[PDB]
Nucleic acid binder design. Structure first.
Ligand SMILES: Nc1ncnc2c1ncn2[C@@H]1O[C@H](COP(=O)(O)OP(=O)(O)OP(=O)(O)O)[C@@H](O)[C@H]1O
Lengths: 606, 192
DNA sequence: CGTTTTATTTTTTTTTTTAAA
């Protein structure tokens, strides 16, 4: 019973209880509770192997394992948590010697991850010094601001060059520093000392549980000295932390103080390869069903013109560059972009929403709701002295992500013409009176293009329909059609399938097996240690067939190709080689181009 | 004093720069020979020097840089006095080089006092805007000569006393004219 | 056992916005 006067907490209890818990530890998930799971030693001892042998410091660790153990530890950790957490670090810093006594025991650890929240909208006096974790989407990308910890002194006679660190804010003054004979008066200087880093960026909560017609309400907090630009800013992320408060300087004439207290959260943590299962990796490549099988997975319920799931073939087994290590010239980036054209309310958002609901780099857009110039970080008025900064653009924070765009022929001429270069150049020359540079960003594009009309007018080859010329309307490889089959035949099918999606009350695990995650990992392996080349085999095809590509150009109101889409073809070459097991070029791949292209390119009848 | 470590690094400093440096001869006297016009004070010395003869005691130099740089400036003066017809009017400017070593991301509290190498561009700049950095004064009474260092940002016109216990808020206005001060400029620069 | 406290206005350039036969 040795305790702060105003509390009920003690070091030894929690220390011993947790050291027994980690001795009551074999991975209690994978060796006590999930015995059907298995990695059989206390994982933290295992880590003191797989940390020390890894030599890879600053562990990360939760504490939700502790529900089985005595919950009083849970509580007094919940409520008094800046005064027990170092004790659990001390237990770890003791565990060092369980597995290596005579190590280089000079480094420390970093570190929760267990408790709940619902939302930020409304909290209470009770919820003042307690553990919380909440999530949303990030807004900003800050700079650093350090923070002091100690005073380094000076002297006048005989070098009374004293020193001393800070509790948090005071140094004392008798007539000299650490009163040493007072040959002179007190001394201080403030630089040769200890400093500490941080930042500040805020979050926008973005769940599906956002109350009705309500605005953004948003939160923010600093960092600590290792938690500092962990962060490609702006995405769906959770934090843990400890609700903090602070009084405020009333007015500013003098030391008066406010009644109201501002709040933020303490600064801790954030939230986001296997040799074991090699078998199926090769198993799926050598299976010719890649054309459709995973494509069959993507739309979970929808066949909606499943030649578009073969258009989803276009898209993943990840996308190789022909970067230019030999000559160094020209920066030939292997970019990819296609659209999903309109004139019928088809799934030209729903797929884009399926994607954004899945990929974290998640944004949805369209004409007339926002500006073309949302790469600005506007200085309408700032918390500065008009040191006008355009901190970070918005539409470009999708680093190899996606922004979904809808209703594309919606905006003015300046909009959507301004982007005639970034597509295959990823440069944004900031040549304004303010600060200047040539920046970099490149990513993926998809939208729901629309002509001047609702329905494609018949009798009338496609180059006439959209109001772009036969250079810009005929630009890409193919910008793909979306029609109604003119009959009831197709119509009733997905009705009959998915009329009862309410009423099915089940899902069928067919031979087109709904891969829970066995899909999601192979693609992550899909780019690592084989490297698609291009030798002498699969290139002469449209070397020669450029005859066939362009000699349809003799014609107005018909259309041939132009020499950026051949680039799009050599970029098509990259994907299929490794998977199906020749990382050197095979010839069939160009057929996929003809399988794609002349589906609406030699549909040039007149 | 601890920093006598760096004074011995400053002994170290002298030890090779006055002695045989390179080429069978001197490296750092034509600088010295040229500085005499305004007492120019600008001199460049290689950091590889702290490898050629200091034998990689750069880590006895490269940490306490703003701590001991003043002393290195003292060494510059102590060099000049040993052979130049001199009075201690000699000031400071030391402009190290030869550091096989190269960024904004590799920055912390921890990076104080080093000699890393960085390159940028020219934008958003400001002009000459000098600073009468040194100067003289005293308290209400009598002691009107102070050749001290009033240059640290914590500087103030009124002082307490020199010879007798005087006032503590009073001030004289004094020799800002037969003395030595500086000049400087200021800009903004962006990542390479 | 005494002798002292405290205020700023108009114009720029960007990004927003808005007008006539
Ligand atoms: N075969 C199909 N399977 C599933 N859904 C379909 C199919 N055909 C049409 N739909 C539905 O039709 C809707 C089309 O409208 P959506 O809101 O995407 O329109 P849009 O593409 O923005 O329209 P537009 O591009 O013409 O403005 C989708 O929500 C989708 O659910």
């Amino acid at each position: 019973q040795l305790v702060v006067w105003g509390t009920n907490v003690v070091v030894s209890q929690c220390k011993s209880k947790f050291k027994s818990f980690i001795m009551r530890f074999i991975d209690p998930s994978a060796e006590q509770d999930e015995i059907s799971e298995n990695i059989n030693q206390p994982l933290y001892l295992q880590k003191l192997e797989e940390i020390h042998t890894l030599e890879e410091p600053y562990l990360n660790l939760n504490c939700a394992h502790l529900k089985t153990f005595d919950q009083d530890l849970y509580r007094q950790l919940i409520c008094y948590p800046q005064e027990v957490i170092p004790g659990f670090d001390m237990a770890i810093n003791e565990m060092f010697f369980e597995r290596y006594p005579a190590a280089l025991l000079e480094h420390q650890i970093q570190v929760f991850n267990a408790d709940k929240t619902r939302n930020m909208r409304s909290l209470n006096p009770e919820d003042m010094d307690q553990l919380i974790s909440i999530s949303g989407m990030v807004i900003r990308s800050s700079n650093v601001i350090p923070e002091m910890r100690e005073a380094f002194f000076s002297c006048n006679i005989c070098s009374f060059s004293t020193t001393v660190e800070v509790d948090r804010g005071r140094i004392n003054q008798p007539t000299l520093c650490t009163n040493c004979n007072t040959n002179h008066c007190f001394r201080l200087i403030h630089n040769r000392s200890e400093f500490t880093d941080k930042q500040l960026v805020k979050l926008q909560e973005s769940p599906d549980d956002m109350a009705a017609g309500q605005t953004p309400h948003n939160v923010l907090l600093y960092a600590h000295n290792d938690l500092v630009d962990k962060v490609q800013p702006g995405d769906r992320v959770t934090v843990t932390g400890i609700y903090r408060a602070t009084p405020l300087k009333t007015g500013g004439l003098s030391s008066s103080v406010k009644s109201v207290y501002k709040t933020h959260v303490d600064v801790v943590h954030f939230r986001k390869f296997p040799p074991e299962r090699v078998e199926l990796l090769q198993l799926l490549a050598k299976k010719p069903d890649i054309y459709d099988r995973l494509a069959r997975a993507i739309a979970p319920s929808i066949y909606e013109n499943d030649d578009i799931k073969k258009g989803i073939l276009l898209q993943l087994f990840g996308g190789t560059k022909k970067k230019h290590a030999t000559l160094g010239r020209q920066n030939f980036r292997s970019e990819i972009h296609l659209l999903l054209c309109g004139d019928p309310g088809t799934s030209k958002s729903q797929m884009l929403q399926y994607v954004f609901n899945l990929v974290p780099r998640s944004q949805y857009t369209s004409g007339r709701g926002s500006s073309a110039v949302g790469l600005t970080a506007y200085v309408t008025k700032d918390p500065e002295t008009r040191q006008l900064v355009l901190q970070t653009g918005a539409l470009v924070l999708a680093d190899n992500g996606v922004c979904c765009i809808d209703e594309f022929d919606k905006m003015n001429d300046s909009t959507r013409s301004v982007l005639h270069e970034v597509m295959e150049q990823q440069t944004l020359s900031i040549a304004k009176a303010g600060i200047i540079c040539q920046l970099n960003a490149r990513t993926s594009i998809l939208a729901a293009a629309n002509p001047a009309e609702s329905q494609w007018n018949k009798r009338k080859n496609i180059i006439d329909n959209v109001q772009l010329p036969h250079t810009l309307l005929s630009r890409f490889d193919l910008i793909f059609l979306v029609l109604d089959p003119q009959d009831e035949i197709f119509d009733k099918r997905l009705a009959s399938h998915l009329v009862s999606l309410y009423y099915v009350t089940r899902h069928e695990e067919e031979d087109t097996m709904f891969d829970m995650s066995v899909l999601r990992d192979y693609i992550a392996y899909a780019r690592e240690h084989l490297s698609p080349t291009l030798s002498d085999e699969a290139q002469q095809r449209l070397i020669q067939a450029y005859v066939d590509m362009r000699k349809v150009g003799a014609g107005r109101g018909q259309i041939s190709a132009y020499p950026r889409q051949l680039e799009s073809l050599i970029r098509l070459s990259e994907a299929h080689a490794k998977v199906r097991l020749s990382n050197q070029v095979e010839l069939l791949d160009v057929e996929e181009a003809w399988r794609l292209h002349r589906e609406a390119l030699k549909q040039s009848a007149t | 004093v601890k920093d006598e470590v760096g004074i011995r690094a400053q002994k170290l400093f002298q030890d090779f720069l006055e002695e045989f440096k390179e080429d069978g001869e001197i490296k750092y006297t034509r600088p010295a020979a040229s500085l005499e016009s305004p007492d120019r004070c600008t001199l460049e010395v290689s950091f590889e020097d702290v490898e050629k003869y200091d034998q990689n005691l750069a880590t006895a130099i490269i940490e306490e840089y703003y701590h001991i740089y003043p002393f290195l400036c003292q060494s510059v003066s102590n060099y000049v006095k040993d052979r130049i017809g001199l009075k201690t009017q000699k000031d400071c400017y030391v402009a190290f080089t030869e550091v096989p070593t190269r960024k904004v991301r590799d920055l912390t509290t921890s990076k104080i006092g080093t000699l890393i190498r960085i390159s940028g561009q020219v934008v958003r700049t400001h002009p000459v805007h000098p600073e009468l950095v040194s100067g003289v004064f005293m308290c209400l009474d009598c002691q009107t000569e102070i050749r001290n260092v009033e240059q640290q940002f914590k500087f103030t016109n009124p002082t307490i006393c020199r010879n007798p216990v005087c006032s503590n808020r009073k001030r004289f206005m004094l020799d800002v004219e037969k003395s030595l001060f500086l000049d400087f400029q200021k800009i903004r620069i962006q990542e390479t």
